[PDB]
Design a protein around this ligand. Sequence first.
Ligand code: FDE
Ligand code: BML
Length: 137
Amino acid sequence: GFKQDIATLRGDLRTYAQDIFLAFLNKYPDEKRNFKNYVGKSDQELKSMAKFGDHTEKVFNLMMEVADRATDCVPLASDASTLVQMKQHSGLTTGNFEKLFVALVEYMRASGQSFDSQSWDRFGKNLVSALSSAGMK
Ligand code: FDE
Ligand SMILES: Oc1ccc(Br)cc1
């Protein structure tokens, strides 16, 4: 289930991070506006960009840590607040997290693997709720 999915994703975190994040940017093209120099790039051009690989892996590592400290797909309120208060990232919004998790769930459902896609959908809605409660716009 969910805990095993954290283990699967981490075992190839760079590749899963990139492919899920590309699914997200392709499903919601306006999301590239928030990232310097992503606009007008193909998937392969983005993969060439040092900060794309580095930043996307750091996004997914943080989401795997929050996921790992969650109970029944409910993250720690204290993790939501540390996220809202992260240096730089003042412009983060819950809607863009709504969309990242929609993309993640559709990726898992299309995978040939026994990901607990319903648990990640729950976790997404619970992280969004928690970020909102913690004062994210
Ligand atoms: C969702 C999310 C999550 C996250 C996470 C993270 C971690 C763990 C870490 C990090 C980092 C970072 N960011 Fe991060 N993140 C995000 C997002 C983001 C955005 C939108 C931005 C902006 C970009 C530009 O264009 O500027 C960022 C941003 C960012 C930054 C800036 C600078 C560079 O390098 O490029 C940094 C450093 N981020 N990060
Ligand atoms: O505002 C946001 C932009 C990108 C992500 Br991923 C999450 C929030």
